[PDB]
Design a protein around this ligand. Structure first.
Ligand SMILES: CCCC/N=C1\SC[C@@H]2[C@H](O)[C@H](O)[C@@H](O)CN12
Ligand SMILES: CCCC/N=C1\SC[C@@H]2[C@H](O)[C@H](O)[C@@H](O)CN12
Ligand SMILES: *[C@@H]1O[C@H](CO)[C@@H](O)[C@H](O)[C@H]1NC(C)=O
Ligand SMILES: *[C@@H]1O[C@H](CO)[C@@H](O)[C@H](O)[C@H]1NC(C)=O
Ligand SMILES: *[C@@H]1O[C@H](CO)[C@@H](O)[C@H](O)[C@H]1NC(C)=O
Ligand SMILES: *[C@@H]1O[C@H](CO)[C@@H](O)[C@H](O)[C@H]1NC(C)=O
Ligand SMILES: *[C@@H]1O[C@H](CO)[C@@H](O)[C@H](O)[C@H]1NC(C)=O
Ligand SMILES: *[C@@H]1O[C@H](CO)[C@@H](O)[C@H](O)[C@H]1NC(C)=O
Ligand SMILES: *[C@@H]1O[C@H](CO)[C@@H](O)[C@H](O)[C@H]1NC(C)=O
Ligand SMILES: *[C@@H]1O[C@H](CO)[C@@H](O)[C@H](O)[C@H]1NC(C)=O
Ligand SMILES: [Cl-]
Ligand SMILES: [Cl-]
Lengths: 603, 605
């Protein structure tokens, strides 16, 4: 009965045999707690959007081969039924690579167990993994297709493949074939590339509808001329019309002026194109989900993206401006719009040192260490995210400062160094490849190595983390390593088994109570770390992401109220990696602050 | 052993043998929805108060004799446990008369079934009923007494008795005897009166600790000296230190400056005096609970009182300044203060007229009317609050306007008049006792009479309501009356029988529905409803009577709507009973509407 298709006559979509144009906003269910899905979707519907667009991050659902996460916050099918229920159509972007400022562009790290794998190509081991994944994901998506009573109207194949070096058309044909096998022959399949013949050359394929992306700085006539070169008939489509842009730690927060977004949007819409706003809400890279660009620069925890809905889902000026623009082409729904959530400043919460990482290896590594003559990568020791401790012992005496070095810039991505429990400093990928250490002969040399996010774009998406090449001490190669994978998540959640200048990396814990019986508490809040330097934060064992007040521009992290409790005290755990304000006699300096406003744009 | 006593040697209270003085705030549980009890008491705790004071309005708990309300919003026992769980002490004021700008000063209207009753006196019928109420309420309060493990440290007997004319000391001794009977010999019993010998004269009694009240305009030294005259030894106590004042419809909203309150509080506390702030939160007079003053002037729906916590419980600047003053004397609790609740503007909701009151008689009055030669009062027809319809026929032709009058000024308190379904205007207690009417001989004369609130202070608390004396037409007494007491609360919850039982316009019901989405964490929120183009009436949402609106007079324009009576997915039904003029006649539906705004307007122009 229900039909969605391209008609090449009036250069648009037909939905059930009538002209249709979509006005869509991106929302990534993996960046919004499920608790807030309906709030974010309804606020989108109230803006006049007739569709949403989302990415399926493969690594978010298949963290090990044959092990799947489809429940609760990982419940993509529920997210799509929710959008359908609210009268929203869906543009589905299942990858397998999605880019998206997300860890390894969505590709699982365990693909790198074949060290020579060519990602995003007809590499047969890559293809076999993708097919297995498609064979799990696509049967789930099939009943959600418009034609089968669901909201899914079009499906993107890959993501900006014309920007990748490999240019493997056999790979794209494999995807087309497999998508067609699981989804049937009616579903509209499409690609998205940069709006210029140089990008379309390797991205476009026969039988996949070619669409472009571009933001407020591109000539709109030209951008659409580049799409029409590939598709002379059918809908003009901008699949990613930038409402804002991404951040990197240590760089200024990106913003795009409302007026530019509204002007461009009106223009796109008036030509009768379908369009998706990237992002409409950005949300947050919780835990270790953020990505990175080459040359190595990680994106921060916040994925606010200067979107119309702020990271916490607030209604912004930009929100109402775009709504006003869409009102010129559609009647938007009636009624008042769900509000920006109330925010509460819980104030200062004092922390106490629980344990250094060194002192906690029993619980961080219950299996015992892996021993190896040379250093092993994260992939080889079977850890994907977080931190691995690399231990050796000095061979020569170092009373005088000896150079500890990764000659091949093989510290991926940052390493916190200690000799016999004296902090020595930091090795930084691309930036600091040498550091002067001291200690006795037979001293324990510790390098705590952080994966700061796998690169999500470009040639270097095969980003093994860890010590990926040798380290040398006074030009001599350090050998005889004792490598500890670290179950930081497990250990924080069990209060490190205790259930019932630099400083050494350590866990700091405190807590705070919220009164019950109060109809408006708990509320959303923002955590601040003044005096801290770099680390990871959990509240009630929930990993809220990374803090780095030392680099900016993000100083506060979003804390959604639903992980806060009133029946029992809430516990905050910080893993500070470089310097904690906690030696002081004054214990009041060893503390975090909850504030009612975000600071993601610090100078 | 748990003890709380007056230390007469040391001019002080002893709590478990230690010196104690209290810094209390008034909160009336009958004026805050239960949903928000814990919110207000925690805000009051976080202010630095170590006690709260509250009244028990008898009529709130015994609407008819031997028929009690002690559950939910009427659950005083629970309110007190909640104050105790928060570590607050409680100063209980159970009347039996409480004043409090509350209908009849808390006295049940049914006491008036004896027309000649002398209230607040040793009149034997008033005593019997008081005694019966104390036998119900006081045994419930006994285990909440500090000595028995609860929060209650002192208990007020009567309320400003010294201001009342009767000066019946036997009455006071009767109360003391019965309070002692149910509560025991250790409870601290006390009285409150104006800070001046002319009030303390009839208020004070041996055995009851004498305390005073006074506000920011009183001389603190003179006030405490009047107290010391009755009580030479023991703690100084201002039982009602006014942080603001009451309103009346038609008068500007009363405010008292934060500075004057702060500096008076400082000085009271510098004396080592115990003090209670009246009000700390004021809340709302829902339904028909408001009182009035003589000469007749009703207090409005809002009981904001310019309190440190606003009507809807907001922290105000006054709150912070008062918290700061207390901090100078006492350590105040640590941690963040629960916030002002989020308010939400639901916007315009259109209503439409469902039925005039005239057309809804059968559902409003299902047992039928009472027939009487001359008019009967609300009490005689067994209705205490709301509206009573009086009906007769014109005994003569009035094709030329003829005067309808209540020569003895006996329309209590407002009558909405119609002849054969044509509205004629309004009769008003004091202001307008005559109204010109037209109609044919034998036409139906209707007077919809509103009880605007029984006087809560003065000699005139025996306020019957209704047509309390005869009407004349062209000077001749009108006879043969058909009187319909109106069951408006029931009729509204059944949607005028629609849902079954599992210039002027005719008084009429207007209804309209609005939805709020489910699965949104922060919806529904508190709101405020406004009535642009409407005149005077009653409003319900989901059958919860939010009180009276009178935007024609002010100063209150909005009414407070607590979030917990609002529902998701299921439509919320607004019912408006407009009494004088509805904006609903033109061919513009969008005029027939109300608006929900996110800020209160109780203090305008
Ligand atoms: C020249 C920049 C091209 C890199 N592409 C980007 S950076 C921001 C966005 C998101 O990553 C999105 O997932 C990409 O499709 C397009 N894009
Ligand atoms: C000037 C006459 C004073 C009448 N008493 C009042 S008006 C405000 C307050 C409350 O009504 C309160 O219930 C009374 O005790 C004292 N009082
Ligand atoms: C866009 O480019 C076209 C040429 O294709 C040109 O005619 C037009 O002026 C340009 N518009 C803007 C906004 O620069
Ligand atoms: C190590 O020490 C040598 C000699 O003291 C010095 O030249 C060098 O700068 C040091 N390492 C670094 C960080 O450059
Ligand atoms: C380290 O050096 C040894 C010996 O030269 C070599 O076998 C090994 O491959 C090197 N490892 C890395 C990661 O460079
Ligand atoms: C937080 O928890 C610790 C230990 O569980 C406890 O000592 C403290 O009272 C709690 N609240 C704080 C830190 O104020
Ligand atoms: C209050 O009255 C006393 C007399 O009892 C007087 O000494 C004092 O000056 C007065 N204070 C004020 C503020 O008027
Ligand atoms: C009633 O009408 C008479 C004229 O018959 C007039 O004198 C009088 O002022 C009117 N009274 C009122 C209350 O309008
Ligand atoms: C009504 O008038 C009659 C006759 O004067 C009188 O007996 C009676 O008391 C009056 N009733 C009222 C309620 O005024
Ligand atoms: C008002 O809502 C009630 C309850 O659902 C219903 O009985 C009535 O018919 C509704 N009217 C409108 C216009 O929605
Ligand atoms: Cl997307
Ligand atoms: Cl009180």
């Amino acid at each position: 009965q229900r039909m969605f298709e391209i008609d090449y006559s009036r250069d648009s979509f037909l939905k059930d045999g009538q002209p249709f144009r979509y006005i869509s906003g991106s929302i990534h269910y993996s960046r919004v707690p499920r608790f807030y899905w309906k709030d974010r979707l309804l606020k989108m519907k109230m803006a006049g959007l007739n569709a949403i667009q989302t990415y399926v991050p493969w690594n978010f659902h298949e963290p090990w081969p044959g092990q799947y996460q489809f429940s609760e916050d990982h419940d993509v099918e529920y997210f799509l039924r929710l959008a359908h229920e609210l009268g929203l159509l869906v543009i589905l972007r299942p990858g397998p690579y999605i880019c998206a400022e997300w860890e390894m562009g969505g590709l699982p790290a365990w693909l790198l167990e074949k060290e020579s794998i060519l990602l995003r190509s007809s590499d047969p081991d890559y293809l076999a993994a993708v097919d297995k994944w498609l064979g799990v994901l696509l049967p789930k998506m099939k009943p959600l297709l418009y034609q089968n009573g669901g909201p899914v109207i079009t499906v993107q194949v890959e993501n900006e493949y014309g920007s990748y070096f490999a240019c493997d058309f056999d790979y794209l044909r494999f995807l087309q074939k497999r998508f067609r096998h699981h989804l049937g022959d009616d579903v509209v399949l499409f690609t998205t590339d940069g709006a210029h013949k140089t990008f379309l050359k390797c991205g476009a394929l026969q039988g996949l509808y070619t669409t472009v992306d571009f933001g407020t700085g591109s000539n709109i006539t030209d951008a659409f001329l580049s799409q029409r070169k590939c598709e002379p008939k059918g809908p003009l489509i901008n699949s990613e019309f930038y409402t804002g842009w991404l951040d990197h730690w240590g760089q200024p927060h990106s913003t795009i002026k409302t007026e530019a977004v509204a002007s461009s949007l009106y223009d796109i819409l008036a030509r009768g194109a379908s369009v998706n706003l990237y992002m409409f809400i950005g949300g947050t890279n919780f835990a270790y989900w953020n990505g990175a660009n080459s040359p190595y620069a990680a994106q921060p925890t916040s994925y606010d993206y200067d979107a119309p809905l702020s990271e916490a889902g607030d209604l912004t000026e930009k929100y109402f401006a775009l709504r006003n623009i869409i009102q010129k082409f559609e009647k938007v729904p009636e009624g008042p719009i769900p509000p920006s959530t109330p925010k509460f400043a819980y104030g200062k919460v004092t922390l106490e040192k629980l344990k250094t990482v060194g002192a906690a290896l029993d619980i961080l590594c219950p299996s015992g260490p892996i021993k190896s003559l040379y250093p092993l990568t994260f992939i080889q020791v079977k850890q994907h995210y977080g931190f691995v401790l690399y231990r050796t012992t000095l061979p020569q005496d170092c009373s005088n400062p000896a150079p500890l070095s990764s000659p091949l810039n093989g510290v991926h991505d940052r390493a916190y160094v200690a000799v016999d429990g004296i902090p020595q400093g930091v090795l930084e990928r691309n930036n600091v490849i040498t550091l002067n250490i001291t200690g006795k002969a037979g001293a324990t040399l510790d390098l705590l190595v952080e994966n700061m996010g796998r690169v999500n774009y470009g040639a270097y998406i095969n980003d093994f983390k860890g010590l990926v090449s040798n380290l040398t001490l006074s030009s001599n190669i350090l050998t005889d390593w004792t490598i500890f994978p670290l179950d930081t998540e497990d250990a924080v959640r069990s209060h490190l088994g205790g259930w019932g200048n630099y400083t050494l990396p350590a866990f700091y814990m405190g807590n705070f109570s919220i009164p019950s019986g109060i109809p408006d508490l708990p509320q959303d809040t923002f955590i601040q770390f003044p005096g801290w330097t770099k680390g990871q934060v959990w509240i009630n064992g929930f990993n809220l992401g990374r803090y780095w007040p030392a680099r900016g521009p993000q100083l506060t992290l979003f804390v959604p109220q639903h992980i806060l409790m009133t029946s029992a005290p809430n516990t905050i755990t910080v893993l500070e990696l470089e310097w904690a304000p906690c030696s002081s006699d004054d214990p009041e300096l060893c503390a975090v602050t909850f504030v009612d406003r975000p600071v993601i744009g610090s100078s």
